[PDB]
């Protein structure tokens, strides 16, 4: 999408592997905020927005 | 209310321990006042802070 309208997608209902994207060397930036990237997979998340 | 002056320490005493229990409620400026969830949030060198 465009930022001005940008396209938001609810993720809901799986086991979502982030060690295959944090891991990945295609991202040029990953910032994360309030949550290390490394302990992403230890936890359990409620209401998951892309 | 004749014997007000026992029940006033016991009531203070049980006051300030109730406190006491309540300020771990509080994170102080802190992203939480649970410790766990800091220490599965964050990476050490900002949990630490």
């Known amino acids: ?50 | 209310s004749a014997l007000g002056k026992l029940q006033d320490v016991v009531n203070q005493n049980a006051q300030a321990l109730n406190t006491l229990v309540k300020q771990l409620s509080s994170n102080f400026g802190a992203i939480s006042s649970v410790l766990n969830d800091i220490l599965s949030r964050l990476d050490p060198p900002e949990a630490e802070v």
């Open chain 1, 1 to 50: 999408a465009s930022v001005y309208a940008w396209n938001r997608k609810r993720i809901s209902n799986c086991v979502a592997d982030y060690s295959v994207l944090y891991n990945s060397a295609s991202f040029s930036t990953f910032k994360c905020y309030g949550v290390s990237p490394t302990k992403l997979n230890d936890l359990c998340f409620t209401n998951v927005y892309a």
